[PDB]
């Protein structure tokens, strides 16, 4: 966390700094998107 990494999370390839988000996702909600529609946040498939 808190470091720039090139990551692939549940078949989603991206590069960014991973930080713990205070937003509350619904159980089905996984991949979040910003105004630009680029991925804002994801959910760890191993330990949710």
């Amino acid at each position: 966390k808190n470091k720039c990494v090139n990551f692939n999370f549940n078949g989603l390839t991206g590069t960014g700094v991973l930080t713990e988000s205070n937003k509350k996702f619904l159980p089905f909600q996984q991949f979040g998107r910003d105004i630009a529609d680029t991925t804002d946040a994801v959910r760890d498939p191993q330990t949710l």
């Binding site: 390839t13 991206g14 590069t15 529609d37 680029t38």
Partner: protein, 49 residues
């Protein structure tokens, strides 16, 4: 016109020779997206000036 907007998605799906065809569509569209912005900004700057 490309399959997907994400570059990391196209690079993860199509062949390197195949991805260059669809990436060519995004860049050309993003150039026109940037050219349209710069063109307006150059024109809006003349309005501000």
């Amino acid at each position: 016109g490309a399959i997907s907007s994400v570059l990391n998605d196209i690079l993860s799906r199509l062949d390197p020779p195949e991805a260059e065809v669809q990436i060519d569509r995004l860049i050309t569209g993003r150039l026109q997206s940037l050219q349209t912005y710069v063109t307006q900004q150059l024109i809006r700057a003349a309005e501000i000036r």
